[PDB]
Amino acid sequence: MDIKYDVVIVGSGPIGCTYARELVGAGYKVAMFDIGEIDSGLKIGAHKKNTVEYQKNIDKFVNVIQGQLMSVSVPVNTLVVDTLSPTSWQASTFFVRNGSNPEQDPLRNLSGQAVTRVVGGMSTAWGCATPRFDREQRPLLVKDDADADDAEWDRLYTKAESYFQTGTDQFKESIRHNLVLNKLTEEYKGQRDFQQIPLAATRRSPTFVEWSSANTVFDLQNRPNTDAPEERFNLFPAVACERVVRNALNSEIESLHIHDLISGDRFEIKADVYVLTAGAVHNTQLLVNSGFGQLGRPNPANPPELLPSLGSYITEQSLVFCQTVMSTELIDSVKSDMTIRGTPGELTYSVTYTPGASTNKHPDWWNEKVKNHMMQHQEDPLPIPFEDPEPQVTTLFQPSHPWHTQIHRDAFSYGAVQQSIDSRLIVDWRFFGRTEPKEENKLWFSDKITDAYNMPQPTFDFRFPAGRTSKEAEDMMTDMCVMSAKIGGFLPGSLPQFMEPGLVLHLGGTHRMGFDEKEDNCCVNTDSRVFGFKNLFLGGCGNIPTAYGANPTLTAMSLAIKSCEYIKQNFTPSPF
Amino acid sequence: MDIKYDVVIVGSGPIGCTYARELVGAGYKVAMFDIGEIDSGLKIGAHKKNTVEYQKNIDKFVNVIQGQLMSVSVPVNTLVVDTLSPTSWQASTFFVRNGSNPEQDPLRNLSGQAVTRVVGGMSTAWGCATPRFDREQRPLLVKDDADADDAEWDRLYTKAESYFQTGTDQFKESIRHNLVLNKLTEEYKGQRDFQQIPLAATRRSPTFVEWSSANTVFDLQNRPNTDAPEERFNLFPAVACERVVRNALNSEIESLHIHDLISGDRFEIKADVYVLTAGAVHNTQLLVNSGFGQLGRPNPANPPELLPSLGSYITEQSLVFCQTVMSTELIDSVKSDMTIRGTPGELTYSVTYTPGASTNKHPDWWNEKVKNHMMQHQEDPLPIPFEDPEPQVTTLFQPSHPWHTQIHRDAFSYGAVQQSIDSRLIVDWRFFGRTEPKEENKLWFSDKITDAYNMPQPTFDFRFPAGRTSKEAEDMMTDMCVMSAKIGGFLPGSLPQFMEPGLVLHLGGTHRMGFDEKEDNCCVNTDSRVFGFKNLFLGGCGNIPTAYGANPTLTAMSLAIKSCEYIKQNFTPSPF
Amino acid sequence: NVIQGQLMSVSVPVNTLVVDTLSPTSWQASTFFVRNGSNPEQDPLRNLSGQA
Amino acid sequence: VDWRFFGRTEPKEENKLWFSDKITDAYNMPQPTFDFRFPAGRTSKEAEDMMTDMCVMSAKIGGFLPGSLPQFMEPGLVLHLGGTHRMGFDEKEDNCCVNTDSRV
Ligand SMILES: Cc1cc2nc3c(=O)[nH]c(=O)nc-3n(C[C@H](O)[C@H](O)[C@H](O)COP(=O)(O)OP(=O)(O)OC[C@H]3O[C@@H](n4cnc5c(N)ncnc54)[C@H](O)[C@@H]3O)c2cc1C
Ligand SMILES: Cc1cc2nc3c(=O)[nH]c(=O)nc-3n(C[C@H](O)[C@H](O)[C@H](O)COP(=O)(O)OP(=O)(O)OC[C@H]3O[C@@H](n4cnc5c(N)ncnc54)[C@H](O)[C@@H]3O)c2cc1C
User: Fold this and answer.
1) Is B506 a catalytic residue?
2) Do residues A232 and A347 share a domain?
3) How far apart are alpha carbons A20 and A24 in whole angstroms?
4) Which of B144, B345, B525, D62 is deepest in the core (most CB within 10 A)?
5) Which residues cross the membrane (chain D) (predicted)?
6) Which of residues 74-103 of D touch A (CB under 8 A)?
7) Beta partners for B428?
């Protein structure tokens, strides 16, 4: 570890890695620090689902996810346990136990919010859905010229899509996928369009998908190396970044204070450029611990000196979920084109179809799989092949249905494998609402309570705003109930519900971007530069200042590509 | 990849790494194949609990464990779900669904048995408890000379302890450990002795333990390399080993058939020596797929040609568990030496003690930690420091209490997170019973159903034997109830219970060792050589033929070391 | 069930269970107010909660 | 087979049933409020020793039924409350409310 770099990046998630890819490639001497460790295979920061064992047992991946999601703010527990033995030590109050946060109102929390501290960040376990935002959901990068703003976002997204290897055809030959897609296309003919979820992923075989991650964006290997002999990059895992040191004039960051967790020593790292990409919660924490914003419980009677909008206007999406069990009609329709002789298990059994018959409701690739499955597993009562890939269907946010949707199967933290119903029958429904930014919705940090790394304890004061946000959330629930019934009935134990606030992990606006600090109530400009500071940049979903329903990471990455363009224009790499 | 090795080893768990450590060091050309992949970071095969993040959030590690444990044999599900929507598809039977095993009687199963497929095997997640077996539990290595047998086991276990870095001091300054240790010592004075659980682990700091694993035994780096230029080792992950090929006379193994899961290629690998260390289930599966034992439902009207005892005489330990909440008397005793004046939280409050006072119940180090906690955290009502390490207590198996005990905290698959009671108050109790080997207790493999890697499906036919095994398992439950009461009452939600059969993952006897194939109803001799075969060796808990209660891995390691001695005496390494 | 049906709890403390999955349109509490027959005088940790 | 072991509780002045002067019950009478903990000392020692006795004695008949593992029941679920208008010989010396004729 040197004491001096051209650029230091805090965090090795996909956004930090976007800065690394751009700046390392442009010849800067770059260090990256992560509080977490390489724990993840030979490919550093790669998706943990990309193992043979996980792709043969996807349900087990829910456990991996649970294992690395650490709750941000847990209120003081008030559960009454009054069946302890009379000899056991017994509480007289609900005192602060087990890491809980006494600052946290349990009724104004994002109790589902959590963070991951591992190299690659949450991209080691994420779902890889990377849709673009439409105008309605997106902040402006160019004022008073929509066509120009659109062109700039098209340019940025196109590059972000290449970095993540986003595509919309990796599930094109799944029967379950096309079954669901075709039925919904028909049911909403001329009202709503359906397509594959845009996924950051590359299909490697009919049973293996290489899901993208941070590693895809930047492989995190130290440079120079054989493959990049003129590049300079070092990743330092197990290092907690604690503070950026401001100059007295509040115009420049002068150093980064770090704590090496393995040795316990502290150090002061110098760079020309500092990029904070620690996630939406921890970028905010690091800033507040550095003198930006206001530490402690918000107190308006006292103006903060710097970035007064920091931690305000936070947004988290409403998320409604259910699972369904595919209708008899749709299952029957899978074999609609089959000719069925004799009985299963018997010499007489025969299942056939004619490749290319124009009377066929399905393509040949489909009928061939159905025929083969039905003939090779005559004990099985379903027409869907065992290895058929999962559905991955969406109808993207529109003004007339202002929510994002995913009609799919994937692992999340609130997964629950159930074993009783055949898994080929099951489809997950997740609709995601947009949340209006309001000043009163805040992430703040205690001036007395600290977290497990001795940093100020994050506290939320959040409610979903009344008015459009609330009305839309409920309309979204009803839309999921109505749309899902086209495919099948609810699965018992996964009935339609709102999910715990924050479980969706789409938190935005904690360090929000705009054109003018005061007018747009914001913290960073459109180059992701912290107002007033020459050399401090923030990346991530914390920058997004709007109400959005779609998954935000692609949009964060795009902002980050725009930020690196500024940096390249304004700082000169040191001599190699 | 080469065509030809001196030694090939199937599996990279700690038993295969024992073979590697011995045989790479003695100059053999060694290849090792594992069906799983590297996924503990840069130290290949290391303990996954060795991150800062897990040691600050140990309960989250239960999810890691659950994530990698795959159930061996799941019977067909017969749960009634009768509240599906009428439009949803439903079969008319409980058909074979979701990977279940139609061979398996649900009432004669080890439903908790599970396997892990990752480089380092189960040692990437294990508890690291490495006790020695006393004579009562231990197979004989020398018959008719008990002191010769004693000396041989002492020499082997001492070696094994060195490989695993086993010690009994890593928790010596934990207040919770010493509170429990001291109380149990005093209460059973004259009857039972207590000590620290022997742990394969090295303390790095007061808040971090480096838990041992396969990596500690052998670092699994390919050789030659700078640190080992005269050594020859290749590790090949993501390779399923499927069969060893017998010569016509059943006197030698001729090759090993493997399937590379990434390329799909299949190869026959040749070696002078073949060592199988794939675990107690998968060793057995590989052998039965290679024409040892009997494939299919056991059929006594049809003696197998080879290894008649293979998969019979299986033993799994009964496991009883509870958690307790520390007694008010014990908690008050933590502070017995303190003089406490004033009211907590006021500037008049003080906690002091008299250093060195002959009448102090605790040592100065303890009282200092108590004092510092109470003064620095006046809002907290307990005297136990927040980062105090967990208890790690045992009274080892003896004839008058013929069960192993762990009185501790650690992460297992059945962990259940608890939030209303302070974790400092909670102690886990796990008592482990020994199970008599009976011929009727079997692991067999389907001749029609295959598993996810297309190998014969494991099936259990198991019940705990009546007579001594069942009597002792109940006496053990009572013992836990009696002993645990000395410390505190049970924690609601963790009441005293038997655990699902096999969840303890201490399965033995599947390929058991003995002196004489026929008289001792066994598969390998005391060199772990398969009877009849000059060049085939099995390692692991499958070899253990006795009824044991303590954790088996150190003993299996000691057997592997002995095996390696035989290999050194009988096979010459190839010129390097 | 007959027994359950005729045993009426003597003192039930104010309920502090967190329900944070209501729809945003539903009316919700800013406090754990006295609800559903509960007894605001009762310390939940010094009760005979099964008395009826 | 069901096993129920019932412990005795030392009468302590601080263990009280009292009635609110503002909150009322469903029949518009003063609402009952408890202030109770099992006394430290003999009551608590006996209660734990009583749990241990049930575990030891039950094991002679059979092992526990899953889902009915040994536990303490919620305080008061036993409905054996006493001492709320206690008897004795002398109102002051025996801290009581009725004499041995049950007369107030
Ligand atoms: C199960 C799952 C499903 C999701 N699915 C999707 C989806 O389909 N589409 C999508 O767009 N989003 C999804 N997300 C969210 C997505 O993963 C995140 O938006 C994304 O990873 C954010 O990237 P980032 O680089 O800003 O932050 P993170 O990925 O959170 O990385 C931040 C990093 O910084 C580190 N760090 C934190 N504090 C410090 C400090 N003080 N010092 C040093 N390092 C620090 C961390 O250890 C971490 O590695 C999902 C996430 C989860 C967990
Ligand atoms: C949570 C938990 C706690 C435990 N606690 C303890 C404890 O405290 N003390 C203790 O003694 N024991 C404990 N154990 C058990 C201990 O981990 C095992 O006894 C030990 O790991 C066995 O070592 P092994 O090398 O024989 O087998 P394994 O560790 O199972 O390794 C066998 C390996 O072979 C591989 N393999 C399997 N099939 C094939 C194939 N066909 N081809 C190629 N490779 C294959 C696997 O991928 C695997 O890595 C615990 C286990 C767990 C999971």
Assistant:
1) yes
2) no
3) 5
4) B525
5) none
6) 74-75
7) B323, B408
